């Protein structure tokens, strides 16, 4: 069930197919959740995407705090901070040297059927 660093596993390469890869490292990724001013919700902002304060340096905003966020379209939007969410993830390396950081559910052990 648990995956450890140094373990050969199976996961999708960037080209979209399953290959054997090796777990390089277990990382922790912190995601921010915010409610935009129009009421739309985001669950996977990075701390650096908050542009009204320096969260990389001083941690997350207070729950409910007004913020501005730089969105994936490069534009800035008004929002309110909802929650911060650390997630255990797996940095994997493929045969060709390419790497990805993936979630537990996207990793398979060598003995298991690929769905």
Residue numbers in the entry: 897 to 1011
Sentences copied from the publication:
KDM4 (JMJD2) is a conserved iron (II)-dependent jumonji-domain demethylase subfamily that is essential during development. From our biochemical and structural profiling, we find KDM4A, KDM4B and KDM4C DTDs display different histone-binding preferences. We show that these DTDs use an aromatic cage as a general mechanism to coordinate trimethyl lysine and, most importantly, the sequence specificity is largely determined by side-chain interactions with surrounding residues.
In all the structures, KDM4A-DTD forms two lobes (HTD-1 and HTD-2; HTD, hybrid tudor domain) with interweaving β-strands. KDM4A-DTD, which displayed strong binding to H3K23me3 as well, also bound H3K4me3 and H4K20me3, consistent with previous findings. KDM4A-DTD binds H3K23me3 peptide at low micromolar affinity (Kd=2.2 μM), slightly stronger than its interaction with H3K4me3 and H4K20me3, and KDM4C-DTD displayed highly specific binding to H3K4me3 (Kd=6.8 μM).
